Design an enzyme around this catalytic site. Sequence first.
Site, PDB file in Angstrom:
ATOM      1  N   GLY A 168      -7.404 -64.471 -67.081  1.00 36.50           N
ATOM      2  CA  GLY A 168      -7.775 -65.522 -68.010  1.00 36.50           C
ATOM      3  C   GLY A 168      -8.814 -66.459 -67.422  1.00 36.50           C
ATOM      4  N   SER A 192       6.162 -68.858 -61.318  1.00 40.55           N
ATOM      5  CA  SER A 192       7.356 -69.690 -61.464  1.00 40.55           C
ATOM      6  C   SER A 192       7.205 -70.716 -62.592  1.00 40.55           C
ATOM      7  N   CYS A 231       9.554 -66.450 -51.793  1.00 37.25           N
ATOM      8  CA  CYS A 231      10.939 -66.816 -51.481  1.00 37.25           C
ATOM      9  C   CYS A 231      11.898 -65.624 -51.527  1.00 37.25           C
ATOM     10  N   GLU A 254      30.585 -81.608 -42.954  1.00 39.04           N
ATOM     11  CA  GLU A 254      31.439 -82.790 -42.818  1.00 39.04           C
ATOM     12  C   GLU A 254      30.968 -83.730 -41.720  1.00 39.04           C
ATOM     13  N   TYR A 312       5.674 -72.956 -42.085  1.00 36.23           N
ATOM     14  CA  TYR A 312       6.981 -72.355 -42.323  1.00 36.23           C
ATOM     15  C   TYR A 312       6.864 -70.857 -42.600  1.00 36.23           C
ATOM     16  N   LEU A 351       6.503 -69.103 -39.166  1.00 34.25           N
ATOM     17  CA  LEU A 351       7.750 -69.089 -38.400  1.00 34.25           C
ATOM     18  C   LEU A 351       8.816 -68.231 -39.073  1.00 34.25           C
ATOM     19  N   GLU A 352       8.926 -68.301 -40.409  1.00 37.22           N
ATOM     20  CA  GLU A 352       9.953 -67.526 -41.094  1.00 37.22           C
ATOM     21  C   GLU A 352       9.747 -66.036 -40.845  1.00 37.22           C
ATOM     22  N   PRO A 381      11.575 -61.999 -51.439  1.00 40.82           N
ATOM     23  CA  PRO A 381      11.545 -61.013 -50.343  1.00 40.82           C
ATOM     24  C   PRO A 381      11.739 -61.623 -48.969  1.00 40.82           C
ATOM     25  N   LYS A 382      11.259 -62.845 -48.724  1.00 35.59           N
ATOM     26  CA  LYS A 382      11.378 -63.380 -47.371  1.00 35.59           C
ATOM     27  C   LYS A 382      12.821 -63.786 -47.046  1.00 35.59           C
ATOM     28  N   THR A 388      -1.867 -71.030 -62.162  1.00 31.39           N
ATOM     29  CA  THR A 388      -2.398 -69.843 -61.508  1.00 31.39           C
ATOM     30  C   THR A 388      -2.080 -69.771 -60.019  1.00 31.39           C
ATOM     31  N   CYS A 395       6.563 -66.392 -55.598  1.00 34.92           N
ATOM     32  CA  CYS A 395       7.940 -66.454 -55.105  1.00 34.92           C
ATOM     33  C   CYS A 395       8.684 -65.132 -55.313  1.00 34.92           C
ATOM     34  N   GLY A 444       3.400 -81.891 -40.751  1.00 37.02           N
ATOM     35  CA  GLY A 444       3.886 -82.537 -41.950  1.00 37.02           C
ATOM     36  C   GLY A 444       5.390 -82.709 -42.019  1.00 37.02           C
ATOM     37  N   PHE A 445       6.146 -81.981 -41.189  1.00 32.71           N
ATOM     38  CA  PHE A 445       7.595 -82.097 -41.075  1.00 32.71           C
ATOM     39  C   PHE A 445       7.947 -82.918 -39.833  1.00 32.71           C
ATOM     40  N   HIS A 463      37.156 -80.053 -44.197  1.00 34.87           N
ATOM     41  CA  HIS A 463      37.397 -79.484 -42.877  1.00 34.87           C
ATOM     42  C   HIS A 463      38.000 -78.084 -42.986  1.00 34.87           C
TER      43      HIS A 463
HETATM   44  C1  FAD Z   1       5.633 -66.441 -48.058  1.00 40.17           C
HETATM   45  C2  FAD Z   1       6.057 -67.537 -49.003  1.00 40.17           C
HETATM   46  C3  FAD Z   1       7.384 -67.960 -49.015  1.00 40.17           C
HETATM   47  C4  FAD Z   1       7.807 -68.977 -49.879  1.00 40.17           C
HETATM   48  N1  FAD Z   1       9.143 -69.369 -49.852  1.00 40.17           N
HETATM   49  C5  FAD Z   1       9.523 -70.330 -50.680  1.00 40.17           C
HETATM   50  C6  FAD Z   1      10.922 -70.745 -50.666  1.00 40.17           C
HETATM   51  O1  FAD Z   1      11.814 -70.292 -49.947  1.00 40.17           O
HETATM   52  N2  FAD Z   1      11.213 -71.761 -51.571  1.00 40.17           N
HETATM   53  C7  FAD Z   1      10.310 -72.371 -52.438  1.00 40.17           C
HETATM   54  O2  FAD Z   1      10.712 -73.265 -53.199  1.00 40.17           O
HETATM   55  N3  FAD Z   1       9.006 -71.966 -52.440  1.00 40.17           N
HETATM   56  C8  FAD Z   1       8.644 -70.995 -51.606  1.00 40.17           C
HETATM   57  N4  FAD Z   1       7.321 -70.595 -51.606  1.00 40.17           N
HETATM   58  C9  FAD Z   1       6.396 -71.252 -52.535  1.00 40.17           C
HETATM   59  C10 FAD Z   1       6.521 -70.731 -53.964  1.00 40.17           C
HETATM   60  O3  FAD Z   1       6.331 -69.316 -53.991  1.00 40.17           O
HETATM   61  C11 FAD Z   1       5.458 -71.398 -54.836  1.00 40.17           C
HETATM   62  O4  FAD Z   1       5.631 -72.810 -54.775  1.00 40.17           O
HETATM   63  C12 FAD Z   1       5.466 -70.946 -56.302  1.00 40.17           C
HETATM   64  O5  FAD Z   1       5.379 -69.520 -56.384  1.00 40.17           O
HETATM   65  C13 FAD Z   1       4.340 -71.588 -57.083  1.00 40.17           C
HETATM   66  O6  FAD Z   1       4.501 -71.283 -58.481  1.00 40.17           O
HETATM   67  P1  FAD Z   1       3.266 -71.324 -59.472  1.00 40.17           P
HETATM   68  O7  FAD Z   1       3.856 -70.992 -60.849  1.00 40.17           O
HETATM   69  O8  FAD Z   1       2.556 -72.631 -59.254  1.00 40.17           O
HETATM   70  O9  FAD Z   1       2.325 -70.126 -58.988  1.00 40.17           O
HETATM   71  P2  FAD Z   1       2.597 -68.583 -58.738  1.00 40.17           P
HETATM   72  O10 FAD Z   1       4.052 -68.344 -58.526  1.00 40.17           O
HETATM   73  O11 FAD Z   1       1.660 -68.136 -57.595  1.00 40.17           O
HETATM   74  O12 FAD Z   1       2.101 -67.920 -60.057  1.00 40.17           O
HETATM   75  C14 FAD Z   1       0.697 -67.842 -60.375  1.00 40.17           C
HETATM   76  C15 FAD Z   1       0.475 -66.493 -61.008  1.00 40.17           C
HETATM   77  O13 FAD Z   1      -0.728 -66.516 -61.816  1.00 40.17           O
HETATM   78  C16 FAD Z   1      -1.540 -65.423 -61.450  1.00 40.17           C
HETATM   79  N5  FAD Z   1      -2.931 -65.739 -61.738  1.00 40.17           N
HETATM   80  C17 FAD Z   1      -3.839 -66.359 -60.921  1.00 40.17           C
HETATM   81  N6  FAD Z   1      -5.031 -66.491 -61.452  1.00 40.17           N
HETATM   82  C18 FAD Z   1      -4.896 -65.915 -62.705  1.00 40.17           C
HETATM   83  C19 FAD Z   1      -5.797 -65.739 -63.773  1.00 40.17           C
HETATM   84  N7  FAD Z   1      -7.069 -66.149 -63.743  1.00 40.17           N
HETATM   85  N8  FAD Z   1      -5.337 -65.132 -64.891  1.00 40.17           N
HETATM   86  C20 FAD Z   1      -4.065 -64.727 -64.927  1.00 40.17           C
HETATM   87  N9  FAD Z   1      -3.125 -64.835 -63.985  1.00 40.17           N
HETATM   88  C21 FAD Z   1      -3.606 -65.445 -62.896  1.00 40.17           C
HETATM   89  C22 FAD Z   1      -1.228 -65.180 -59.985  1.00 40.17           C
HETATM   90  O14 FAD Z   1      -1.686 -63.883 -59.626  1.00 40.17           O
HETATM   91  C23 FAD Z   1       0.295 -65.338 -60.026  1.00 40.17           C
HETATM   92  O15 FAD Z   1       0.936 -64.193 -60.577  1.00 40.17           O
HETATM   93  C24 FAD Z   1       6.872 -69.570 -50.745  1.00 40.17           C
HETATM   94  C25 FAD Z   1       5.547 -69.151 -50.732  1.00 40.17           C
HETATM   95  C26 FAD Z   1       5.127 -68.140 -49.868  1.00 40.17           C
HETATM   96  C27 FAD Z   1       3.682 -67.704 -49.877  1.00 40.17           C
HETATM   97  C1  FAD Z   2      48.183 -73.095 -42.627  1.00 38.91           C
HETATM   98  C2  FAD Z   2      47.572 -74.458 -42.844  1.00 38.91           C
HETATM   99  C3  FAD Z   2      46.199 -74.572 -43.059  1.00 38.91           C
HETATM  100  C4  FAD Z   2      45.601 -75.824 -43.253  1.00 38.91           C
HETATM  101  N1  FAD Z   2      44.231 -75.883 -43.475  1.00 38.91           N
HETATM  102  C5  FAD Z   2      43.686 -77.066 -43.656  1.00 38.91           C
HETATM  103  C6  FAD Z   2      42.245 -77.132 -43.873  1.00 38.91           C
HETATM  104  O1  FAD Z   2      41.472 -76.171 -43.916  1.00 38.91           O
HETATM  105  N2  FAD Z   2      41.763 -78.436 -44.053  1.00 38.91           N
HETATM  106  C7  FAD Z   2      42.528 -79.606 -44.032  1.00 38.91           C
HETATM  107  O2  FAD Z   2      41.962 -80.700 -44.196  1.00 38.91           O
HETATM  108  N3  FAD Z   2      43.878 -79.522 -43.825  1.00 38.91           N
HETATM  109  C8  FAD Z   2      44.415 -78.311 -43.642  1.00 38.91           C
HETATM  110  N4  FAD Z   2      45.771 -78.232 -43.421  1.00 38.91           N
HETATM  111  C9  FAD Z   2      46.546 -79.484 -43.412  1.00 38.91           C
HETATM  112  C10 FAD Z   2      46.448 -80.239 -42.093  1.00 38.91           C
HETATM  113  O3  FAD Z   2      46.984 -79.435 -41.044  1.00 38.91           O
HETATM  114  C11 FAD Z   2      47.268 -81.528 -42.190  1.00 38.91           C
HETATM  115  O4  FAD Z   2      46.928 -82.245 -43.373  1.00 38.91           O
HETATM  116  C12 FAD Z   2      47.112 -82.483 -41.002  1.00 38.91           C
HETATM  117  O5  FAD Z   2      47.308 -81.795 -39.766  1.00 38.91           O
HETATM  118  C13 FAD Z   2      48.068 -83.654 -41.087  1.00 38.91           C
HETATM  119  O6  FAD Z   2      48.007 -84.391 -39.851  1.00 38.91           O
HETATM  120  P1  FAD Z   2      49.198 -85.310 -39.388  1.00 38.91           P
HETATM  121  O7  FAD Z   2      48.675 -86.150 -38.214  1.00 38.91           O
HETATM  122  O8  FAD Z   2      49.665 -86.012 -40.622  1.00 38.91           O
HETATM  123  O9  FAD Z   2      50.327 -84.276 -38.882  1.00 38.91           O
HETATM  124  P2  FAD Z   2      50.313 -83.166 -37.743  1.00 38.91           P
HETATM  125  O10 FAD Z   2      48.922 -82.727 -37.482  1.00 38.91           O
HETATM  126  O11 FAD Z   2      51.329 -82.074 -38.164  1.00 38.91           O
HETATM  127  O12 FAD Z   2      50.818 -83.922 -36.408  1.00 38.91           O
HETATM  128  C14 FAD Z   2      52.185 -84.355 -36.259  1.00 38.91           C
HETATM  129  C15 FAD Z   2      52.593 -84.029 -34.847  1.00 38.91           C
HETATM  130  O13 FAD Z   2      53.731 -84.846 -34.468  1.00 38.91           O
HETATM  131  C16 FAD Z   2      54.722 -84.010 -33.899  1.00 38.91           C
HETATM  132  N5  FAD Z   2      56.027 -84.640 -34.072  1.00 38.91           N
HETATM  133  C17 FAD Z   2      56.872 -84.554 -35.150  1.00 38.91           C
HETATM  134  N6  FAD Z   2      57.982 -85.242 -35.016  1.00 38.91           N
HETATM  135  C18 FAD Z   2      57.860 -85.821 -33.759  1.00 38.91           C
HETATM  136  C19 FAD Z   2      58.699 -86.680 -33.023  1.00 38.91           C
HETATM  137  N7  FAD Z   2      59.881 -87.121 -33.461  1.00 38.91           N
HETATM  138  N8  FAD Z   2      58.268 -87.085 -31.802  1.00 38.91           N
HETATM  139  C20 FAD Z   2      57.086 -86.650 -31.358  1.00 38.91           C
HETATM  140  N9  FAD Z   2      56.211 -85.845 -31.964  1.00 38.91           N
HETATM  141  C21 FAD Z   2      56.659 -85.461 -33.170  1.00 38.91           C
HETATM  142  C22 FAD Z   2      54.541 -82.660 -34.579  1.00 38.91           C
HETATM  143  O14 FAD Z   2      55.127 -81.623 -33.798  1.00 38.91           O
HETATM  144  C23 FAD Z   2      53.010 -82.576 -34.601  1.00 38.91           C
HETATM  145  O15 FAD Z   2      52.518 -82.112 -33.346  1.00 38.91           O
HETATM  146  C24 FAD Z   2      46.402 -76.979 -43.220  1.00 38.91           C
HETATM  147  C25 FAD Z   2      47.773 -76.864 -43.009  1.00 38.91           C
HETATM  148  C26 FAD Z   2      48.370 -75.617 -42.825  1.00 38.91           C
HETATM  149  C27 FAD Z   2      49.859 -75.529 -42.574  1.00 38.91           C
END
Ligand code: FAD
Ligand code: FAD
Lengths: 588, 588
Positions: free
Chosen positions: A223, A112, A154, A571, A291, A294-295, A156-157, A252, A149, A318-319, A566
Amino acid sequence: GTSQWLRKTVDSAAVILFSKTTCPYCKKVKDVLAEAKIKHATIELDQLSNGSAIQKCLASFSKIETVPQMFVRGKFIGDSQTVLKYYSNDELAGIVNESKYDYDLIVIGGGSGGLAAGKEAAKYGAKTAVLDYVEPTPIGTTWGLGGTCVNVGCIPKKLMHQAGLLSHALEDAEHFGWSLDRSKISHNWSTMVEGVQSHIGSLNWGYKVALRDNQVTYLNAKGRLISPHEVQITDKNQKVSTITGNKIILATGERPKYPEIPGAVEYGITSDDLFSLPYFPGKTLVIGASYVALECAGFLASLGGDVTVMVRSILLRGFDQQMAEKVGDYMENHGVKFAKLCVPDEIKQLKVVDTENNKPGLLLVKGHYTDGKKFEEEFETVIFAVGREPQLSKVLCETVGVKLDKNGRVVCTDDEQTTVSNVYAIGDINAGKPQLTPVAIQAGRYLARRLFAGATELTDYSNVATTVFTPLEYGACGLSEEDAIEKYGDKDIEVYHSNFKPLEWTVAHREDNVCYMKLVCRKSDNMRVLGLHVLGPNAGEITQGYAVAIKMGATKADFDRTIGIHPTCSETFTTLHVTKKSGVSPIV
Amino acid sequence: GTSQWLRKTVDSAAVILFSKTTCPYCKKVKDVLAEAKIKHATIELDQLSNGSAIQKCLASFSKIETVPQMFVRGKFIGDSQTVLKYYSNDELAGIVNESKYDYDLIVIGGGSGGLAAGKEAAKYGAKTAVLDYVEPTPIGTTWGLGGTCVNVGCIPKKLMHQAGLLSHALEDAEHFGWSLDRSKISHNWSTMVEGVQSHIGSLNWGYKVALRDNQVTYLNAKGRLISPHEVQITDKNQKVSTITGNKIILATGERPKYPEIPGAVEYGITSDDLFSLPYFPGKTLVIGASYVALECAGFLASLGGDVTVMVRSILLRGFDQQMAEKVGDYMENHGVKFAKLCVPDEIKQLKVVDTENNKPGLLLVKGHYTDGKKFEEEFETVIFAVGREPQLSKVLCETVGVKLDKNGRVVCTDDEQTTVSNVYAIGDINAGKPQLTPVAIQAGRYLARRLFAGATELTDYSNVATTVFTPLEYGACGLSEEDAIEKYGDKDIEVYHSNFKPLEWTVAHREDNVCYMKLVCRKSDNMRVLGLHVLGPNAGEITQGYAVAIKMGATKADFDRTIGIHPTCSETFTTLHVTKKSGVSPIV
Ligand SMILES: Cc1cc2nc3c(=O)[nH]c(=O)nc-3n(C[C@H](O)[C@H](O)[C@H](O)COP(=O)(O)OP(=O)(O)OC[C@H]3O[C@@H](n4cnc5c(N)ncnc54)[C@H](O)[C@@H]3O)c2cc1C
Ligand SMILES: Cc1cc2nc3c(=O)[nH]c(=O)nc-3n(C[C@H](O)[C@H](O)[C@H](O)COP(=O)(O)OP(=O)(O)OC[C@H]3O[C@@H](n4cnc5c(N)ncnc54)[C@H](O)[C@@H]3O)c2cc1C
Ligand SMILES: CN(C)c1ccc(CNn2cnnc2)cc1
């Protein structure tokens, strides 16, 4: 102050042009270099604050105060007329190629950080070599260019993690109205390994193409640094030779450890072997509780394996331990078995791996619990995940003078410099740094710019966010709760927390109060967010955006005044209000 | 200035105790207060930086300067000795229930904002009524307490989105090694609607229980404000009566519009109807191009339907148009048909809806393209998504004095106050505000705190993040690219952008360069991030965290210096480097 930056940039760059955006004489030289296909750094002096002071200080090297000025490896080369004279006389290519060393940069390790350092250096004209060699595992597993990695980490896992997740997708689909019977579907391990290995092969190939298209020399050889500027290489035919470089980057990495017990190396495997294993592991024992352990145990169970984890003391040392325990309870309720406070003593072979018919062997594992009681059970596969270590004696000759720590990692300054002024280290072997692929990539890219482009930006290693990709993922940024309390005192720590249920889980009839999040805040500092923690689906995508806010000093008020999106899980961080000190339940 | 706050707090608060943290006489009053089940606000004067000045200004009301001081509806009640005397004399309950009005607060509208305003007011001792009534749709659809999002908005539509996503999960499962055959699986609409409606039903019930547990009066009646303190109610038997309240919060929301063409009301439906429709829509025409229209067409198509969208002019007017088009293109490549630059002229009925055998009818739709060519086609269902509007005429007698803008929405000050000093408005009918559920909830809760607990915090409506839940999701926070340019000039705007591919899509053989993200920055303000845009899976979870950093003033430098989490899509925001000015391709 500025004077020692300029000395550093001129002495280290390979080809560097001091320029100005407005000047057409500079444009004349840029185009000569572009046409000649000479790559180089460029320092536009009008786009920097102290730029007028540098123009004057350049004269210390060149005796002129004007722009453009071009340098090769510390040596002034000319102004616009002098470089054009070299171009017109065909003297230019030999001037820009003359060096005391074979390469401006040698990178030991093609993973890396190493590949990122290498590609970035070549951008600015550095003649660069990248060395990579993959020492086989005890059963002979080996893989291509790209590092831990890409090949056995990272990539393959997380792909096998996704295969595991798709199983609950299949379960959920019935409740959402799809006509499938989850009960009557099975998983084919080798089909999945073929897909994962095919993607990995496209990455090996991509990296080799990238190196070639940057004029980086890639040598598949082991090397060894024998002197500050000399690297000894050993190729596939065991042929030895020596190359020299001005700057040296060690990158390395590490490899898995084995416990010092009978049978382990002979009959066990590690993660290095798991990702290209040709047979399904069958009934598996995972020893360790990091990790990695467990992973792997997590997706093996989701794919249908009989899985057991042997835990010496705690999970995820450590976590944050509340989060670690919630991770572990989830796995235990979804079919991972745990052998708690238990360590292994020996592995006995009962059946050799049937390598023809593509079947696992059979093993006997014997160990004891921490009270004294005994452990004995048979498994088809045993996977050790008990930590990783570097082995710099393979790489580094003790006479060269690079200081290591008690663990075996390279002691470096905050700009990655070793105790030898021209040797640097990045990635997992840099002592004290987070061992993570994005960290190594940033460290490598930022160092290359300081060496060959005059940059000053250092890598920031604090508050780097993580994600553990267990069957229920766990994302974190910053301090665990116990570390915060320890560093500031319980009376200065406030913790807002809450359970939540993804909307996606309602119609699927999944659990109500299993996902969880918390903010750990410091009272005396405006309720600053010290650490963020979230257990739930997509935890990596949830956490990542908040790492930016934490880097910027976010407070509870900043989270409060921001509005939710939402419906999302994330959120829930924007309306937290229950404190731990209050005793109120966090359930929904 | 401090005296104006205290007079406002004392006058509107229902029951409020002025106190100090360490004050045995105050604690003696607190214990009497909640022993008698008297809810109240409490202001601990030692927690405010100018609590010394506040303590003095209290004497202008009570003639005393000590703590505790208890007020009810603007009138000073007494110190410690006086309140206890009222307690042991059985006079206290009658004191605290003394009001010129029936209620301290009347909320008109039981949806996102109104339920949230009401529950929060009740916590601080305000006597509260929440009114909610659901005008049935043209075909008679009606639903329960909770408002638009809970019954006919965010909640049902994301559950159905998820049902649609699960179809590509089943597809992706085979490539990861599961044995199922996607082409042999179908979707049962009524099974899905049943699960969705059962979850919605549990929200309806949960809200009724929450109002009862907070001592909120829930009236299932339609409300009408006939004078500043007088609300006319009509119940489910057309019985008419009048209730009074001190403070009035309008929160009545909007309803879907219908185009003024023949057959629309009679034979088409809206989203109000779609989420509980007893039969699968079948071949469907969606008329409109808002996020509602695109979201519904999107999951109808994923669930196996033959779907067409009729677009008058552009997709997602008001959102960034490059992103809108990428959203549109993905849908068209995955089986949604588009009829562009087209409007409906009439709907004609060919079959009546078969309510017995549970089948849609059949309709003939006729329209025209902007160039005059003709549109004529048959569909089983026609869904109108051509916007939403309030109808405050059925809520607000004109003589009351509440000013409206030209769209029918309430003009409010930045504290939600209307032109009548004791009437406020929140949620979708508040003119000029983002129309989103988290905004309504936050405005309602903060307003309740200002009315009844002496709070001062206002609702911040700037840079609220959004997510459009189309088949490939689109999350945003801040300015579109075209808005940034119009406000600052192209020369001051820089755009970093990149394509990406989720790791989950590699083994499943999905598209290489469809997902996309960009950061819109202002060069002269230190490369401030003006807008963030991402198209891809889990876009809401990706975007949410970054909204906190944008709220805080984040810059490109803050994104650069934060490290990514690997492997995630969201990490791509931490290494962006290709600019639009540069002309370099954003492919990977
Ligand atoms: C199972 C596993 C899962 C992981 N998952 C994550 C993840 O999800 N996210 C994340 O951020 N990190 C993850 N890591 C850690 C991440 O892989 C390492 O932090 C990263 O690969 C380190 O990079 P590096 O360049 O220091 O070494 P490396 O990536 O190991 O590179 C060193 C390279 O140099 C080679 N080398 C060694 N000695 C010599 C030499 N003398 N001459 C020439 N070449 C040589 C080695 O063979 C290797 O190819 C994971 C590690 C493991 C083991
Ligand atoms: C299809 C769709 C998808 C949406 N998806 C999202 C989303 O993913 N994320 C997001 O943030 N927003 C989303 N919205 C918007 C969100 O629904 C509105 O912004 C939010 O509900 C506004 O809340 P309000 O309290 O202003 O009105 P409302 O939630 O409409 O409440 C007003 C209520 O008062 C009632 N009412 C009206 N007049 C009267 C009265 N005279 N007497 C008594 N009760 C009355 C109405 O019937 C209603 O029950 C979506 C809207 C739609 C139509
Ligand atoms: C005006 N200031 C800043 C203030 C006043 C009172 C309180 C406590 N009463 N409360 C309840 N919910 N929010 C506030 C907090 C802040």
